From Swiss-Prot, chain A:
Protein name, as recorded: Syntaxin-1A
Marked site positions, (Microbial infection) Cleavage: K48, A49
PTM summary: Phosphorylated by CK2.
Residues of the full protein shown: 206 to 256 of 288
Gene: Stx1a
Function as written in the Swiss-Prot or TrEMBL entry: Plays an essential role in hormone and neurotransmitter calcium-dependent exocytosis and endocytosis. Part of the SNARE (Soluble NSF Attachment Receptor) complex composed of SNAP25, STX1A and VAMP2 which mediates the fusion of synaptic vesicles with the presynaptic plasma membrane. STX1A and SNAP25 are localized on the plasma membrane while VAMP2 resides in synaptic vesicles. The pairing of the three SNAREs from the N-terminal SNARE motifs to the C-terminal anchors leads to the formation of the SNARE complex, which brings membranes into close proximity and results in final fusion.
Assembly description: Part of the SNARE core complex containing SNAP25, VAMP2 and STX1A; this complex constitutes the basic catalytic machinery of the complex neurotransmitter release apparatus. The SNARE complex interacts with CPLX1. Interacts with STXBP1. The interaction with STXBP1 promotes assembly of the SNARE complex. Interacts (via C-terminus) with KCNB1 (via C-terminus); the interaction increases in a calcium-dependent manner and induces a pore-independent enhancement of exocytosis in neuroendocrine cells, chromaffin cells, pancreatic beta cells and from the soma of dorsal root ganglia (DRG) neurons.
Source organism of the structure: Rattus norvegicus (Rat)
From Swiss-Prot, chain B:
Organism superkingdom: Eukaryota
Subcellular location: Cytoplasm, Perinuclear region; Cell membrane; Synapse, Synaptosome; Photoreceptor inner segment
Protein name, UniProt field: Synaptosomal-associated protein 25
Family per similarity comment: Belongs to the SNAP-25 family.
Purpose of the protein: t-SNARE involved in the molecular regulation of neurotransmitter release. May play an important role in the synaptic function of specific neuronal systems. Associates with proteins involved in vesicle docking and membrane fusion. Regulates plasma membrane recycling through its interaction with CENPF. Modulates the gating characteristics of the delayed rectifier voltage-dependent potassium channel KCNB1 in pancreatic beta cells.
Interaction with CENPF as annotated region, ranges: 1-49
Region (Disordered): 1-23
Subunit structure: Part of the SNARE core complex containing SNAP25, VAMP2 and STX1A;this complex constitutes the basic catalytic machinery of the complex neurotransmitter release apparatus. Recruited to the SNARE complex following binding of the SNARE complex component STX1A to STXBP1. This complex binds CPLX1. Found in a complex containing SYT1, SV2B and syntaxin-1. Found in a ternary complex with STX1A and VAMP8. Interacts with HSC70 and with SYT9, forming a complex with DNAJC5. The interaction with SYT9 is inhibited in presence of calcium. Isoform 1 and isoform 2 interact with BLOC1S6. Interacts with CENPF.
Basic and acidic residues bias: start-end ranges: 1-20
Modified how: Palmitoylated. (Microbial infection) Targeted and hydrolyzed by C.botulinum neurotoxin type A (BoNT/A, botA) which hydrolyzes the 197-Gln-|-Arg-198 bond and inhibits neurotransmitter release.
Length: 51, 49
């Protein structure tokens, strides 16, 4: 049961490890495509800036 | 002879520990049924997220 306690406590670590990491992806969630929203919407102009 | 004796006798209970102390081991086996599953619960849903 102490082996259980240890793995369960390392797992209430682990579940929370991946939990707390998990939202950083939501932090990317803006910077992944709104970043694209800058890049493509800009280079559609840079290619039209020659004109 | 003309003898009829039909008789009975009584039992000696072997000392089967003769205390509740058995419970504590039984409490450990409770907890290993109890505290184990949620590991898998949060495990499968940790894997979902």
């Amino acid at each position: 049961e102490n082996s259980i306690r240890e793995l369960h406590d390392m797992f209430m670590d682990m579940a929370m490890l991946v939990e707390s990491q998990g939202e950083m992806i939501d932090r990317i969630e803006y910077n992944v495509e709104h970043a694209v929203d800058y890049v493509e919407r800009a280079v559609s102009d840079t290619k039209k800036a020659v004109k | 002879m003309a003898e009829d004796a039909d008789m009975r006798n009584e039992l000696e209970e072997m000392q089967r520990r003769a205390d509740q102390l058995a419970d504590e081991s039984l409490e450990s086996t409770r907890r290993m049924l109890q505290l184990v599953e949620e590991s898998k619960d949060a495990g499968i849903r940790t894997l979902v997220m």
